[PDB]
Amino acid sequence: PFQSYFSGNTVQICPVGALTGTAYRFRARPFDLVSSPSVCEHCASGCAQRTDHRRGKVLRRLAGDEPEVNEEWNCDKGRWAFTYATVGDRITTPMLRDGGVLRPASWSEALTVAAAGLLTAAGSTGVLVGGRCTVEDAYAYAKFARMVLNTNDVDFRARPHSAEEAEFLAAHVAGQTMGLRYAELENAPTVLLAGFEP
Amino acid sequence: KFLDALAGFAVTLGSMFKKPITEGYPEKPGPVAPRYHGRHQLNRYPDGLEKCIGCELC
Numbered sequence A: 001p002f003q004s005y006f007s008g009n010t011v012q013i014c015p016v017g018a019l020t021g022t023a024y025r026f027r028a029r030p031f032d033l034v035s036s037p038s039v040c041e042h043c044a045s046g047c048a049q050r051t052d053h054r055r056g057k058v059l060r061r062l063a064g065d066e067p068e069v070n071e072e073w074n075c076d077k078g079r080w081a082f083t084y085a086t087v088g089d090r091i092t093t094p095m096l097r098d099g100g101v102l103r104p105a106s107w108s109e110a111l112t113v114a115a116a117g118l119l120t121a122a123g124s125t126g127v128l129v130g131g132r133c134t135v136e137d138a139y140a141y142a143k144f145a146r147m148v149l150n151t152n153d154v155d156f157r158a159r160p161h162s163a164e165e166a167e168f169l170a171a172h173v174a175g176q177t178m179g180l181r182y183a184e185l186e187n188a189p190t191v192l193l194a195g196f197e198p
Numbered sequence B: 001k002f003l004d005a006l007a008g009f010a011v012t013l014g015s016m017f018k019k020p021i022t023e024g025y026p027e028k029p030g031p032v033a034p035r036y037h038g039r040h041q042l043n044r045y046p047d048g049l050e051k052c053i054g055c056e057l058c
């Protein structure tokens, strides 16, 4: 098989219908698509993408165009890994534990119970923020931990990690925006990779 | 003769002896033009296959 992590680009690069996406096959015509700019959710590459949805369902995610980040390319993960939100496991309503069973609940009741529990726990709480969060979402999680819980037990690392990692991120990464850039990568005479499979 | 001003009467009286022209819908519906834009219809080939290819051009 074709077998490339970037195969979808060919579908987007073909100037004709010769190469088509099997997932998108016969799904819609251009006029039937609501098209929006977007960013991929999957890795730190942050590629510009174009999400196309018909009938409220996302049908494809084209590569977009951002010369400073991704030129006009994707990987298959970014281009096609969008169905996760509609596989039928999505949480549609707030859920509450009662009698050991997870039951659908209102927003009012759910917030009541969550506030009760969190106030009962007070500072004996820790917030695992995970890595699937927008900058705003992470900021809200952190601020919520700092004030609403009066705790510093905040970690977005849902993965193997270490204290040395947090120390390094504080020392060199955090607060240091827009240093090395993709454009710089292209011209770096020598690139070394430590624990990194690009 | 002042009669011209009364021509309308001659009209209405005359019409009440010519036959009414109303179409008899629904017992006797009127003839709609052959080209009329009636309800869309999806057609088939003589073997029964649906003509529509789902191109969404319509």
Ligand code: SF4
Residues within 6 Å of the ligand: A016, A017, A018
């Ligand atoms: S058949 Fe498809 S690829 Fe060929 S001209 Fe028509 S739209 Fe383009």
Ligand code: SF4
Residues within 6 Å of the ligand: A040, A041, A042, A043, A044, A045, A046, A047, A070, A073, A074, A075, A076, A077, A078, A079
């Ligand atoms: S398109 Fe591919 S490389 Fe770009 S952010 Fe998404 S998963 Fe990462």
Ligand code: SF4
Residues within 6 Å of the ligand: B051, B052, B053, B054, B055, B056, B057, B058
């Ligand atoms: S335009 Fe295409 S989709 Fe619409 S009725 Fe004709 S063949 Fe079918």
